Structure formats: structure tokens, C-alpha cells
Nucleic acid binder design. Structure first.
Ligand SMILES: [Mg+2]
Ligand SMILES: [Mg+2]
Ligand SMILES: [Mg+2]
Ligand SMILES: [Mg+2]
Ligand SMILES: [Mg+2]
Ligand SMILES: [Mg+2]
Ligand SMILES: [Mg+2]
Ligand SMILES: [Mg+2]
Ligand SMILES: [Mg+2]
Ligand SMILES: [Mg+2]
Ligand SMILES: [Mg+2]
Ligand SMILES: [Mg+2]
Ligand SMILES: [Mg+2]
Ligand SMILES: [Mg+2]
Ligand SMILES: [Mg+2]
Ligand SMILES: [Mg+2]
Ligand SMILES: [Mg+2]
Ligand SMILES: [Mg+2]
Ligand SMILES: [Mg+2]
Ligand SMILES: [Mg+2]
Ligand SMILES: [Mg+2]
Ligand SMILES: [Mg+2]
Ligand SMILES: [Mg+2]
Ligand SMILES: [Mg+2]
Ligand SMILES: [Mg+2]
Ligand SMILES: [Mg+2]
Ligand SMILES: [Mg+2]
Ligand SMILES: [Mg+2]
Ligand SMILES: [Mg+2]
Ligand SMILES: [Mg+2]
Ligand SMILES: [Mg+2]
Ligand SMILES: [Mg+2]
Ligand SMILES: [Mg+2]
Ligand SMILES: [Mg+2]
Ligand SMILES: [Mg+2]
Ligand SMILES: [Mg+2]
Ligand SMILES: [Mg+2]
Ligand SMILES: [Mg+2]
Ligand SMILES: [Mg+2]
Ligand SMILES: [Mg+2]
Ligand SMILES: [Mg+2]
Ligand SMILES: [Mg+2]
Ligand SMILES: [Mg+2]
Ligand SMILES: [Mg+2]
Ligand SMILES: [Mg+2]
Ligand SMILES: [Mg+2]
Ligand SMILES: [Mg+2]
Ligand SMILES: [Mg+2]
Ligand SMILES: [Mg+2]
Ligand SMILES: [Mg+2]
Ligand SMILES: [Mg+2]
Ligand SMILES: [Mg+2]
Ligand SMILES: [Mg+2]
Ligand SMILES: [Mg+2]
Ligand SMILES: [Mg+2]
Ligand SMILES: [Mg+2]
Ligand SMILES: [Mg+2]
Ligand SMILES: [Mg+2]
Ligand SMILES: [Mg+2]
Ligand SMILES: [Mg+2]
Ligand SMILES: [Mg+2]
Ligand SMILES: [Mg+2]
Ligand SMILES: [Mg+2]
Ligand SMILES: [Mg+2]
Ligand SMILES: [Mg+2]
Ligand SMILES: [Mg+2]
Ligand SMILES: [Mg+2]
Ligand SMILES: [Mg+2]
Ligand SMILES: [Mg+2]
Ligand SMILES: [Mg+2]
Ligand SMILES: [Mg+2]
Ligand SMILES: [Mg+2]
Ligand SMILES: [Mg+2]
Ligand SMILES: [Mg+2]
Ligand SMILES: [Mg+2]
Ligand SMILES: [Mg+2]
Ligand SMILES: [Mg+2]
Ligand SMILES: [Mg+2]
Ligand SMILES: [Mg+2]
Lengths: 60, 253, 49, 96
RNA sequence: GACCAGGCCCGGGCGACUGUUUACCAAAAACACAGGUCUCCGCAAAGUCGUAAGACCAUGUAUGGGGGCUGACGCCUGCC
RNA sequence: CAGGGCCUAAGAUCAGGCCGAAAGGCGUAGUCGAUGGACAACAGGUGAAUAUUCCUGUACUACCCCUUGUUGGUCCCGAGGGACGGAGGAGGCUAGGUUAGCCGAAAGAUGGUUAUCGGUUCAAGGACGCAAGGUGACCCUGUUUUUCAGGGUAAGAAGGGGUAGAGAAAAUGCCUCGAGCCAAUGUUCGAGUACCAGGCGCUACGGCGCUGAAGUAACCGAUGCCAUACUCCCAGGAAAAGCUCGAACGACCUUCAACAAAAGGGUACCUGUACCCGAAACCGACACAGGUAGGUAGGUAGAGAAUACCUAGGGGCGCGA
RNA sequence: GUGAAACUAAGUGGAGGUCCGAACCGACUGAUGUUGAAGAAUCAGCGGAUGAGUUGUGGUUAGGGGUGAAAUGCCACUCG
């Protein structure tokens, strides 16, 4: 019943950082290649979807 | 007949879950999925604990096989499920061992069974557990024995040699009328978690070797074909030289 | 001698039924907390809703 | 059994950073006998209780922490009803 | 007495039926289906995925598991 | 209160292990992983912006502290329990609602009239308790079998005890003792100098200080509670920990050490907490006629959570003439 | 009803991919919209609504692939 463009819905931050998170990119070799080449471009933010385990941004 | 008990320690919840998905997570075995959650009953197929006297307390339904199953007690308080033999009634008594009466539900090595007997739940390998003829209404006759080897006629009609020291159980497997049911509606398939199958002829060429000819397709394939490109009809797949071959005598007809 | 057994088993019974019932209210309160009509004050401002 | 490890390793003299003086806090003193102290985020309640209990030499009923949206821990320290708050308010320099 | 609240009948084709489907031009006579039938498979099964190890099939065992065509029920299914 | 300091599902990672040009792939114990299991708090007040969090009342968990009572406790292991479907209807009840009764005010410029308008509220928790409810075998006689009445049978229910086998607990077999049991709800404390219609006075005319009457009954009645209670069906309906029980095996600790109890006093880990959330704050590039899980469910008419007109509460659509 | 059984009202019972119909899921016709209020809507009607149902949270399968009640459909407004 929802429009095509609605692909990005309200999804728990917990779920997202379990996907694009830091600790995930660290696991695979391809991820470490990721972080090298982000660091090369010198991005202010390495992993965009990340998330505090507990704190002000914490998902329960 | 079917009256639910509380849970004996033989009924657990641990099991494979993705049905038809392998490690890679792919559907290997097509059409499964959906259907009622089940619990695994731990059957005793080996019947290995010898020389104690068991009593059939009840008869229970099992979702994992079309046969019935019987809860039996012992004088030792151990409880086991066995496949329900045909005609066995509650209050009955069974026993396994070597020198034993021959009646329904007793299990013994093939050295001691009088030729002509109707047998089920047949080990092919010493102490591996019973393997052959476990389904509803399945039975195999012990036709002849010679040397170290016994000869059976399996429910497929195939005649085959096995070891004379492999245990088996007297009597046919119960619930004979099961294939007399008529499911009657689609939903009643789905309840068993058997999902709908598409005919080859329907799908597009990419998807299957009988691919869409314009209106309706005769199968132009010079031969009926597996999804994967093999002849569908009458091509024997039995591994040419399997170790088994020396044992097998006449082939199912 | 039968009066001893009866008074001991009524002591036990009173105990078990006490703990049982305590347990039961607790469980109810929990269910309600999950659903979210809990503090009976809360329900009593929405009664007419 | 063993030495009692404090929840983290901090150095107690840095945990109580400062009294927070605004119109708000002062009447928490008046009504509640409760001081208001900005403290180190890394600091706990047991640490704060020992710290004030020894430092100003007052027995403290209960502590309540808070964490600002700015990431700075803030603590309501409600002393006992024997020790008056305004005592420590004059002793410190917080004037009601 | 407002709001709310079935037009119905006589025919024929197709598909038995409830279902599914071309997100955003096609909802059907297409797909599924219960049922039928052919064929493979004796358990270290056939089949599928993997370079392999192994996984599914199945913690099942021929009244079960693959695959092909047809498509309820009724009458049938001829020659080469 | 919600997560973490507890437990596991799908799944994920995976010591050693098997395989593989490399990166890696499979996989066992282990360890992660809630959308589930376990586990203790409510009413009133304050309130520029927080409140089951702060205040005042009664509570409740987990430890520690002392008295008393025992001598072995602790983990590892053995067990019971936790522990589970759908559909159906019948009960027994509350929540709400309506009408009386009691109480206070009332004149609302009209032909009449008090037939009018307000109030009648209270939680968690603790003690008690259970029938017209539901369950407790059979046989004879009747009430329609049923709710029942007389007799009888000897475990015949929740619930306990004993014994036997390699056998502690358990499971299993034999023996015995028990006619009650079950749980929503109810009575009483909590609870009144609480709350509240009005009344009095101030008005920075915003709000404020002051004193407070009655506080019961009947009939409707749930989709909520007992309740995993029943009856039926086939498609046959999670695990693990806390919890209860317990000998041998192994490890460790041991006397004012540890455990067992009823009181008494004490003691109290992190993180979330603003605001919006049928949205102008999320998702749609917009202050966009759209999408967004759950909870609470008043009146009159009505079969109804449809519809119409309304209460509480919220709004009059950010261009007008 | 006969000795067995069959046959037939009755009551009880509450089956169903039953019926009508809100929520909810869809998307059949028409009108409007077409530099839209909106990159698929609004309005009036319409289909299913105890099931082969709907949905939440957390997961799975990945491009010589996956998934498909099969439309070359879908795989972040992109899919021979
Ligand atoms: Mg961004
Ligand atoms: Mg179970
Ligand atoms: Mg159990
Ligand atoms: Mg994987
Ligand atoms: Mg088909
Ligand atoms: Mg096609
Ligand atoms: Mg494709
Ligand atoms: Mg494929
Ligand atoms: Mg081809
Ligand atoms: Mg073709
Ligand atoms: Mg043609
Ligand atoms: Mg309403
Ligand atoms: Mg404050
Ligand atoms: Mg806090
Ligand atoms: Mg027609
Ligand atoms: Mg014509
Ligand atoms: Mg059709
Ligand atoms: Mg679909
Ligand atoms: Mg279309
Ligand atoms: Mg259609
Ligand atoms: Mg269309
Ligand atoms: Mg189609
Ligand atoms: Mg078929
Ligand atoms: Mg194979
Ligand atoms: Mg066809
Ligand atoms: Mg697992
Ligand atoms: Mg791995
Ligand atoms: Mg390794
Ligand atoms: Mg593992
Ligand atoms: Mg965890
Ligand atoms: Mg949870
Ligand atoms: Mg907790
Ligand atoms: Mg809690
Ligand atoms: Mg507020
Ligand atoms: Mg409050
Ligand atoms: Mg009070
Ligand atoms: Mg306690
Ligand atoms: Mg255990
Ligand atoms: Mg459960
Ligand atoms: Mg009822
Ligand atoms: Mg009432
Ligand atoms: Mg009236
Ligand atoms: Mg009167
Ligand atoms: Mg007048
Ligand atoms: Mg009145
Ligand atoms: Mg009470
Ligand atoms: Mg008490
Ligand atoms: Mg009674
Ligand atoms: Mg014993
Ligand atoms: Mg003994
Ligand atoms: Mg016993
Ligand atoms: Mg009534
Ligand atoms: Mg309902
Ligand atoms: Mg049941
Ligand atoms: Mg020992
Ligand atoms: Mg003890
Ligand atoms: Mg808050
Ligand atoms: Mg709030
Ligand atoms: Mg909106
Ligand atoms: Mg606007
Ligand atoms: Mg809008
Ligand atoms: Mg209404
Ligand atoms: Mg009407
Ligand atoms: Mg009415
Ligand atoms: Mg309405
Ligand atoms: Mg209004
Ligand atoms: Mg229907
Ligand atoms: Mg219909
Ligand atoms: Mg669709
Ligand atoms: Mg519409
Ligand atoms: Mg409709
Ligand atoms: Mg309908
Ligand atoms: Mg049904
Ligand atoms: Mg969806
Ligand atoms: Mg589909
Ligand atoms: Mg085409
Ligand atoms: Mg993209
Ligand atoms: Mg797309
Ligand atoms: Mg396309």
C-alpha cells in the first residue's frame, strides 16, 4: 500500500549497525580493504551506520 | 488409538530448521517450507537393550512418519518409543534378544527367524539401527538363508542379501490405511509443508528445458528432461559399481 | 494421630496456596505491563476513551 | 573475598567537578536538602557517595545521577535530614 | 420515513472449486490445486549445491524421497 | 518501569578438528543473539520544562547484620519442574455504564415548571475467606441424564506417605492414608483531618489562600479475568536458566567457619527517561490530500469497533476579499 | 426396524480453504488528476475477510547467482 520510493523505512539502528557497523567491516578481509580505502580518501566518518552499545544513541 | 499424553523425555524441540536449505542456505530440496511446527520423537530403532520385558502402555501419533508409535515401559522404568506393529493392542508385551518366542513386536537376529516370516524395521549393518521397511504398511518377507547371508524381499519387491546377524522385528508396520486418505484440498497439502510445484512446460527457456513455445508447448526436446538437463524417463541412476552390488539379486519390477 | 497429619498438611497447603496465588497476581501484573494498560491510575483516565 | 575493585579506575579528586548554581538547583536545596553537582561521566554512584561522605563529612541518604544531552553527568545528592543542606550551602559558597 | 442497506431472470463459451499472478498500462480462459499416470531411487538412496571437506534430502526408508506430463467428479483413452 | 549485571530460539561466530592457489570453506564444545522464559511499587501531592524516578503515606525484592538451632556445606553430576496448538460454546465474575437513593446548589427576563444542574472517588499490598461456579470413579432407584435424594463399594480426586529391583532422588511395580479440592472475585485492613460539589475571601483580575456536605443501592454487562477450565479436531502444537528434589564420582572450602529458619534493624549496580510519535519533528526531496507495529474503547439509536448525532479531549485545514 | 443390522423424523452438537459484513489485506470498473495535492494518488462504487490468512520484531538465501502458486516476475523509483 506504500509507494515504491519508500525503500528506506524506520528500521532499528541496532539492526543496521549489525550490517553496516564497524565491527562487521572489521571481520571480513573485503571489509578491511573497505576501511583502508575510506581512510585513504580521508573520510571524517568511517562507518556511517554504527551504534553505541549503550549510551545516548543506544538501541535496547 | 490417538489420545495425547503429556511429554515424556523422548519428545524434544531440537531440529534442523530451514527445510530444504543446505549450508550455503540455498534451496537444494525443492517444495518444502510452510507447515505445522513438529516435535521430534526419539524412536528406538536399535531395540538394542536385550532380555528385559517391555509392555505397551499406549499408542501415539507422530508427525514425522506415517506409521504410528508406541510408548512402552519396562520393569526398569526406562521408556522407549517403538514403531507400532500391525495388530498390536495396548497391554501387549514385547521383548528382544536371541532366543525368543516369535510373535508381533519381538525383535531378533535373522539367524533365529523361521523362513517365510514377515518382518519390518530391518538393520542392514550390525548395531547401526533398523533401516529398511519402517513406513506405514511396509513389510519384508524372509525368503531363504544360506552361509553368512540372509535373503529378503523388500517392500519394493527387490530381493536382496543382508547379514545373518542383523536384527529385525516380527510383524508388519501398523496404520495400514494411511494412503487411503484423500486430501481433498490444496490447503491440506500445505499443512504438511509441501509447497506448490510448477510444471516445466510452463516456465521460460532460461528456467527450464521445456521452455515456452508460443501458445502451449509440446515438449520439443526429443526427450523429457529434468530441470537440470538429463533424460527424465527410464535412465538408471544407480551408481554402476557400488559395493552393494554383490548383495543385490533381483531388481524391483 | 490423624489430626497431626491433617494440621501439618493444612500448614503445607496454606503455604503452597499462598505462594501460588502471590505468583499469579505477579504474572498478571506483568502481562498488563507488557500490553501497557498498567498503572491503574492510567486506565482510569482513559476509561471513557 | 578479594580487594573491592571500584567499578572503574578513576581518581576521586577529579570526579566532583562543580556545584551547579542556577534558580532551579537552589530550591532543590530548600525543599529536598539536595545538592547539585556536575561530575565526571565515567563516575558512578558508589564513588560519589564515598567522595562526598568523606570530603564534606556528611552522611548521604541517596544519590541520583543524570546524563545531559551534552554528555556531562549531573548528580542530585540528597543528604540525611539530620544534616541541613543550607549548612553546606554556606560552607561552600552557594547562597540561598 | 435520515444515515446505513442485494437489482433479478433466461441462455451459451472457458476454467471444476477458495486461492496466485505481470510493484507503476494485462487479473484472465494464464499459474496453482485435490486426483490421475509414467519413470528413477535398497539407504555409504536417487536428486541438488560445493574445487574439495561436507551440507541438504532426512535425524526420513518404497503406504517414503526425486523428476516428467495431465489436471475435481462422470464416460473413456483408439491405431503406428 | 525498559534493556545490561540472568537463559536460551532462528541465526551468527567458532578453540582445538576436516578440507582449500591465497583470501578462506565446513564444523564440535564454547561464546554471542529477544521479537520469547526468569525477576520486586502503588495512591495522592508538587510541577516554566521531569516523575511508577522528587516529596508523604503504606508496600515489596536481593543481600548484610545480629540472636537461636544444627554440624559438614559448595560446585560437578542424577532427576522433577519450567513447557507451551487450533476451533467451539457454556458458565462464574469484574471493568465499565445506566437508573434510583443521599447531598449541595438552582430561577437561567417566554405559556407552564423544579420534572433542573452539579457531586456520589479511591491503588499496589497484607490478612481472612469460596457457592447458585468448576472438578472429585462406579452400581441400583427416581428428578429430562443434569442441579439433586438414600444406600453401597474401599483409593475412588487434589494431595501426601511407605516399600521393591544394580535403584539416593526420579521413573516403574505392589501397599497405604486422605473427601475434599480449584481460582477469578468477595469481606476486612490499607483509607482518612486523603480526594471532592460547592462556601469564603484576595485579585498582578493569570492564579491564589481559607473551611468542606453525602460518599450507598438496583438493573444492564464485556472482545477483559478464572483459563493451558472444559469439549472437540488433526495439521499434533520451542529451548535453556532461575526454581524443587538428591546418593555414589570429581574438585574446592572448613569453625564460631558454613548452611537452616521466624522475627528485628540496616544496605541499594550501570544505560534509557526532554519533545514528536493516525506525525509540520519518523518514512515520502516540501510545513507534501500518502505510508507507519502496539495499548485504552463513554452516551443515544443500532446486530455492531458499521453508520448518524454527541461527551472527554482536541481542532477550524498559513492567502484573502 | 429386525434376532443380528439397515432405514427414518427428532433433539443435542458446532464442522467448513461455508455465507453476509467492519478492522485488516487487496486492486475490478468509472470519473478526476497529467508543468499532479501525489514519480501511481483521491473520489464513488468493488474482491478476500478462520485461512493456501494478515502483520510486528530478529534473522536467512547475492548476480556464470538468489527467489519465483511462472508474469521474464522480484532482488533499495535500476532487472532478458
Ligand atoms: Mg547518510
Ligand atoms: Mg515438549
Ligand atoms: Mg517435562
Ligand atoms: Mg551462511
Ligand atoms: Mg503443477
Ligand atoms: Mg509463460
Ligand atoms: Mg533469473
Ligand atoms: Mg533456480
Ligand atoms: Mg536451454
Ligand atoms: Mg518447447
Ligand atoms: Mg500453437
Ligand atoms: Mg469511543
Ligand atoms: Mg527538580
Ligand atoms: Mg538513571
Ligand atoms: Mg456462464
Ligand atoms: Mg461462440
Ligand atoms: Mg478459475
Ligand atoms: Mg505474493
Ligand atoms: Mg500491472
Ligand atoms: Mg480476478
Ligand atoms: Mg489492473
Ligand atoms: Mg500466472
Ligand atoms: Mg501432483
Ligand atoms: Mg548421494
Ligand atoms: Mg494444462
Ligand atoms: Mg543454534
Ligand atoms: Mg566461518
Ligand atoms: Mg581453526
Ligand atoms: Mg556450536
Ligand atoms: Mg545476551
Ligand atoms: Mg523482550
Ligand atoms: Mg533485571
Ligand atoms: Mg522488571
Ligand atoms: Mg510533559
Ligand atoms: Mg504519581
Ligand atoms: Mg494515603
Ligand atoms: Mg524479601
Ligand atoms: Mg539440570
Ligand atoms: Mg511460550
Ligand atoms: Mg463469558
Ligand atoms: Mg460499578
Ligand atoms: Mg434520568
Ligand atoms: Mg426524591
Ligand atoms: Mg421560561
Ligand atoms: Mg443527578
Ligand atoms: Mg485488596
Ligand atoms: Mg506479612
Ligand atoms: Mg459447591
Ligand atoms: Mg529410590
Ligand atoms: Mg534404598
Ligand atoms: Mg514413586
Ligand atoms: Mg446478568
Ligand atoms: Mg474475535
Ligand atoms: Mg487444549
Ligand atoms: Mg564425594
Ligand atoms: Mg538445604
Ligand atoms: Mg520521562
Ligand atoms: Mg515522557
Ligand atoms: Mg498522515
Ligand atoms: Mg500547511
Ligand atoms: Mg500531510
Ligand atoms: Mg458506542
Ligand atoms: Mg440498521
Ligand atoms: Mg443498546
Ligand atoms: Mg465512525
Ligand atoms: Mg468540545
Ligand atoms: Mg470464508
Ligand atoms: Mg465468496
Ligand atoms: Mg499483488
Ligand atoms: Mg477505494
Ligand atoms: Mg469491502
Ligand atoms: Mg465478505
Ligand atoms: Mg475453521
Ligand atoms: Mg509486507
Ligand atoms: Mg509470489
Ligand atoms: Mg513472454
Ligand atoms: Mg541505490
Ligand atoms: Mg525495482
Ligand atoms: Mg521489467
Amino acid at each position: 500500500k506504500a509507494a515504491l520510493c519508500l525503500t528506506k523505512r524506520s528500521r532499528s539502528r541496532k539492526s543496521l549497525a549489525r550490517t553496516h557497523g564497524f565491527r562487521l567491516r572489521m571481520s571480513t578481509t573485503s571489509g578491511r580493504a573497505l576501511l583502508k580505502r575510506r581512510r585513504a580518501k580521508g573520510r571524517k566518518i568511517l562507518c556511517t551506520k554504527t551504534n553505541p552499545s549503550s549510551g545516548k544513541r543506544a538501541s535496547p | 488409538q490417538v489420545k495425547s499424553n503429556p511429554r515424556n523425555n523422548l519428545i524434544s524441540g531440537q531440529r534442523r530448521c530451514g527445510k530444504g536449505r543446505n549450508a550455503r542456505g540455498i534451496i537444494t530440496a525443492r517444495h518444502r517450507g510452510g507447515g505445522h511446527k513438529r516435535l521430534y520423537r526419539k524412536i528406538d530403532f536399535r531395540r538394542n537393550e536385550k532380555d528385559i520385558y517391555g509392555k505397551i502402555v499406549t499408542i501415539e501419533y507422530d508427525p514425522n512418519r506415517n506409521a504410528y508409535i508406541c510408548l512402552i515401559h519396562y520393569g526398569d522404568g526406562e521408556k522407549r518409543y517403538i514403531l507400532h506393529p500391525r495388530g498390536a493392542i495396548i497391554g501387549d508385551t514385547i521383548v528382544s534378544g536371541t532366543e525368543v518366542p516369535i510373535k508381533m513386536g519381538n525383535a531378533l537376529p535373522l539367524t533365529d527367524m523361521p523362513l517365510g516370516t514377515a518382518i519390518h524395521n530391518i538393520e542392514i549393518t550390525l548395531g547401526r539401527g533398523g533401516q529398511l521397511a519402517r513406513a506405514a504398511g511396509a513389510v519384508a518377507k524372509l525368503i531363504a538363508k544360506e552361509g553368512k547371508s540372509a535373503t529378503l524381499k523388500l517392500p519394493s519387491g527387490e530381493v536382496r542379501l543382508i547379514s545373518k546377524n542383523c536384527s529385525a522385528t516380527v510383524g508388519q508396520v501398523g496404520n495400514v490405511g494411511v494412503n487411503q486418505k484423500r486430501l481433498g484440498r490444496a490447503g491440506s497439502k500445505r499443512w504438511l509443508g509441501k509447497r506448490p510445484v510448477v510444471r516445466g512446460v510452463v516456465m521460460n527457456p532460461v528456467d527450464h528445458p521445456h521452455g515456452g513455445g508460443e501458445g502451449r508447448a509440446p515438449i520439443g526436446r526429443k526427450s523429457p528432461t529434468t530441470p537440470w538437463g538429463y533424460p527424465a524417463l527410464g535412465r538408471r541412476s544407480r551408481k554402476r559399481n557400488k559395493y552393494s552390488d554383490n548383495f543385490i539379486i533381483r531388481r524391483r519390477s | 494421630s490423624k489430626l497431626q497429619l491433617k494440621l501439618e498438611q493444612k500448614m503445607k497447603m496454606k503455604m503452597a496456596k499462598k505462594i501460588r496465588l502471590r505468583r499469579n497476581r505477579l504474572m498478571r501484573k506483568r502481562k498488563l505491563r507488557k500490553r501497557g494498560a498498567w498503572p491503574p491510575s492510567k486506565m482510569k483516565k482513559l476509561k471513557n476513551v | 573475598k578479594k580487594l573491592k575493585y571500584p567499578r572503574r579506575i578513576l581518581d576521586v579528586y577529579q570526579i566532583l567537578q562543580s556545584p551547579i548554581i542556577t534558580e532551579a538547583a537552589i530550591k532543590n536545596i530548600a525543599d529536598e536538602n539536595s545538592l547539585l553537582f556536575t561530575v565526571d561521566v565515567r563516575a558512578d554512584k558508589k564513588m560519589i557517595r564515598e567522595a562526598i561522605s568523606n570530603f564534606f563529612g556528611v552522611k548521604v541518604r541517596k544519590v541520583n545521577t543524570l546524563i545531559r544531552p551534552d554528555g556531562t553527568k549531573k548528580a542530585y545528592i540528597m543528604l540525611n535530614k539530620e544534616y541541613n543542606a543550607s549548612e553546606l550551602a554556606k560552607k561552600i559558597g552557594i547562597f540561598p
